[PDB]
Amino acid sequence: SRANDAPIVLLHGFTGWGREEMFGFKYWGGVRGDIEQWLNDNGYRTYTLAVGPLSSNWDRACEAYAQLVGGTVDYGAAHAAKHGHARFGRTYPGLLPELKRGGRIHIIAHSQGGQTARMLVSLLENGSQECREYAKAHNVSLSPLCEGGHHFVLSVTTIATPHDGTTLVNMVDFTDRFFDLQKAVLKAAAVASNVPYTSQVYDFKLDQWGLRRQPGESFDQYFERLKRSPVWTSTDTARYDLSVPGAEKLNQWVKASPNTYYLSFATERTYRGALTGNYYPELGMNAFSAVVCAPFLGSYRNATLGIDDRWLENDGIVNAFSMNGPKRGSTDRIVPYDGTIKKGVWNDMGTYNVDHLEVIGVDPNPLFDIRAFYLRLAEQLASLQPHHHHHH
Ligand SMILES: [Ca+2]
Ligand SMILES: [Zn+2]
């Protein structure tokens, strides 16, 4: 029973690109196909957001808001001044004008997109105090995203999200490995990193930072520049927010809204040793993560940061423990799924035996029925009721 008709909006993580990009190879489906199309085909209106993969959740949230209702992206004057990037970014037609007219949406987010979705909701409802103050004080204008009072989001579903960050960021060679992961994902799309394609192919959307791939520059080369850029060296980055300390900081202000349903899906593609207590990558995990990231994730302990044995189980990219919802520096409630989806709390939907990329189809896994997974999910979302009544 379909209790609602709101559309679904897909939101990628630290890798991701629009439907026209990457020669049509979809982030949402990868080698499996087109998740969006599947859903639409089954009666579930579905759209796709594309925002800065490497940008800070804040940056992304602003981009998302503009992309959704239309308009010129406004990163906030206080923010922009604080971090040293442009206040105004690209312009968007707007995907869903129904939003300004009282319609709502369901957001389905992968990886870091989960952090972004949460933030979007928080800003939409509550705005930003810092933002508002600075405006009043300096006589500058404010985006409605900073004011609050919106009623746009019915639910948020996160999949393989580092709510509490990912120890991946602690690798000695994280900078280089992280970009190799981007190269990996290009590779998946049948796209080379040593070729100076004239077409855009994969736009990092770094307009605020004044960065873009140049004529004659390969992705390898471009990445070499990015590594030394503010989108990697500043705190206003995905790098920072993805870290354990960064995620905590974000958790301190990004709270679950009582007017919104939250569903959390975890992922794991590992086994435990006996002699070590470490977690190891399972056969089938994506090649990149199996060699380069999983070993580390499955063995990295840090008493100070709070990284114990609980954090070892991983999906090749994110520690499973981080995925059920924000906990580090968080007041949000998390409840194990009991058949009943509850509002204003993290409905912990459990852990699935799929890797970070398999779950979106970017890496194959013939044993994972992806279509069924998204379809079951869509039905869940579409079943969500406006309100409830106590009963025995
Ligand atoms: Ca696989
Ligand atoms: Zn910023």
Side-chain angles (χ1 to χ4, degrees):
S1 173
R2 176 142 212 189
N4 80 82
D5 298 329
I8 291 166
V9 180
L10 304 177
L11 189 54
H12 64 82
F14 61 70
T15 63
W17 54 85
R19 294 171 60 82
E20 90 277 21
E21 324 189 53
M22 215 74 106
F23 295 103
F25 180 91
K26 303 299 179 279
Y27 173 88
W28 288 97
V31 300
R32 309 293 298 271
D34 190 345
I35 298 164
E36 199 190 74
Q37 199 58 59
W38 301 343
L39 300 191
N40 268 310
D41 279 354
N42 285 275
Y44 307 102
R45 196 140 66 93
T46 303
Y47 305 77
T48 307
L49 292 172
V51 302
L54 309 189
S55 305
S56 78
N57 281 294
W58 173 277
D59 284 19
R60 303 165 30 113
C62 307
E63 293 157 24
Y65 165 82
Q67 189 155 168
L68 286 163
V69 310
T72 285
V73 174
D74 178 357
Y75 299 104
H79 179 100
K82 176 194 196 181
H83 300 298
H85 75 57
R87 182 175 154 188
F88 293 120
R90 79 181 59 193
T91 307
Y92 289 104
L95 285 175
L96 300 152
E98 54 188 84
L99 292 164
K100 301 174 275 141
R101 290 170 40 236
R104 291 176 100 172
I105 64 172
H106 301 280
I107 302 168
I108 299 187
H110 179 249
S111 176
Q112 209 152 21
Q115 281 183 315
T116 310
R118 291 176 38 218
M119 190 180 292
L120 185 48
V121 166
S122 174
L123 285 173
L124 278 172
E125 212 155 85
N126 307 302
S128 167
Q129 177 170 19
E130 200 176 334
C131 192
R132 284 187 300 266
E133 313 226 286
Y134 186 102
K136 198 158 132 182
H138 307 289
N139 295 313
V140 286
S141 63
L142 221 48
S143 170
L145 198 48
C146 288
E147 309 177 308
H150 298 86
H151 297 301
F152 287 1
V153 193
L154 190 166
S155 74
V156 171
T157 298
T158 76
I159 309 170
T161 297
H163 295 291
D164 299 324
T166 175
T167 61
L168 197 53
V169 308
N170 298 88
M171 285 200 287
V172 309
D173 62 336
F174 174 61
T175 291
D176 288 348
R177 303 301 102 187
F178 184 85
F179 285 89
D180 286 347
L181 165 52
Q182 296 289 338
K183 304 196 180 161
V185 160
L186 283 163
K187 178 159 126 154
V191 170
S193 56
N194 75 337
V195 173
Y197 297 102
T198 70
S199 296
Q200 187 73 267
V201 180
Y202 193 10
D203 179 3
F204 281 72
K205 300 176 196 66
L206 300 165
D207 289 34
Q208 86 284 54
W209 296 113
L211 307 160
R212 75 190 185 163
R213 180 165 62 86
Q214 308 297 303
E217 198 174 30
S218 68
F219 277 110
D220 284 333
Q221 295 170 326
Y222 181 47
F223 293 169
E224 280 310 310
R225 285 198 291 125
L226 290 188
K227 281 174 217 202
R228 295 144 61 81
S229 80
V231 84
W232 197 249
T233 72
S234 81
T235 61
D236 186 33
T237 63
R239 171 181 200 190
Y240 178 68
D241 291 356
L242 197 64
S243 77
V244 174
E248 176 166 37
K249 189 163 193 38
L250 176 161
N251 288 355
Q252 292 184 132
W253 72 275
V254 187
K255 314 293 174 76
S257 157
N259 297 310
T260 296
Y261 290 100
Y262 297 79
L263 295 84
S264 57
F265 290 91
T267 53
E268 70 82 22
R269 204 71 158 82
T270 60
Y271 68 94
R272 189 172 178 276
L275 288 217
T276 71
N278 290 351
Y279 279 70
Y280 304 81
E282 286 189 336
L283 155 82
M285 177 197 268
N286 80 86
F288 182 58
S289 307
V291 175
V292 186
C293 307
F296 181 85
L297 294 171
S299 65
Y300 182 66
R301 298 166 177 81
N302 199 323
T304 277
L305 266 79
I307 300 336
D308 58 29
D309 280 38
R310 287 175 298 176
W311 283 78
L312 303 193
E313 187 173 49
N314 70 77
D315 77 354
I317 303 291
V318 185
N319 314 88
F321 187 69
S322 185
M323 307 171 179
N324 66 347
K327 310 170 276 323
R328 306 272 297 244
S330 193
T331 63
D332 280 17
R333 184 153 92 89
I334 302 166
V335 180
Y337 183 52
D338 77 342
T340 308
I341 310 298
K342 323 206 154 94
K343 207 133 170 204
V345 301
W346 291 93
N347 295 278
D348 182 345
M349 313 300 286
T351 306
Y352 287 69
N353 175 214
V354 288
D355 80 9
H356 203 78
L357 299 175
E358 300 177 328
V359 76
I360 51 169
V362 165
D363 193 74
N365 185 341
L367 300 182
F368 172 56
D369 190 345
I370 187 156
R371 163 180 320 86
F373 178 105
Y374 290 93
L375 288 183
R376 168 175 69 254
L377 176 48
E379 309 165 1
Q380 259 147 31
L381 301 179
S383 86
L384 296 175
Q385 291 290 354
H387 224 271
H388 316 297
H389 309 291
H390 68 283
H391 60 82
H392 287 96

